[PDB]
Nucleic acid binder design. Structure first.
Length: 122
DNA sequence: AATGAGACCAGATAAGCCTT
DNA sequence: GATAAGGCTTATCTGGTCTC
């Protein structure tokens, strides 16, 4: 009797949580393994008909081996650099309203940008 | 000579990414 | 079974200069 639906639901919920949680301490493997199983157990206890503790361990072992092996601080930077690259690319800075460039005092002084700045070195 | 128009430094900083 | 929403990048900001 394999239980595909609840298994899924547990594997999907927890894996998403684990990707983020591993960064809180980078617990060494033996502790991380216990951590993730324990999160599988907390969701499981929610279901009207929870899976067995053995099944919880299996789904938990899976997430924890994958995530311990693939995740790392350098890892997180790489992701954040890739996203940040997309982000800086389609992002534009607007004029800041309280700046010389924006208030344009030369326009009010009758003269132009370049004359205003030449008259300041003096 | 002294302006303007514009291209230029070079340092700083918001916006935007993902999809929590 | 699948890969990271806060560390990071890019575009443009800025006060100034400088030719033509």
């Amino acid at each position: 009797h394999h239980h595909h639906h609840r298994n899924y639901h547990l594997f999907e919920k927890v894996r998403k949580w684990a990707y983020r949680a591993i960064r809180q301490g980078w617990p060494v493997f033996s502790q991380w393994l216990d951590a993730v199983i324990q999160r599988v157990e907390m969701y499981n206890a929610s279901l009207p008909v929870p899976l067995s503790p053995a099944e919880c361990r299996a789904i938990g072992k899976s997430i924890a081996k994958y995530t311990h092996r693939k995740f790392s601080p350098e890892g997180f930077s790489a992701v954040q650099a890739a996203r940040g690259r997309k982000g800086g690319t389609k992002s534009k800075r607007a004029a800041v309203p309280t700046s010389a460039r924006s208030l344009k005092p030369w326009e009010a002084l009758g003269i132009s940008r370049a004359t205003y700045y030449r008259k300041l070195k003096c």
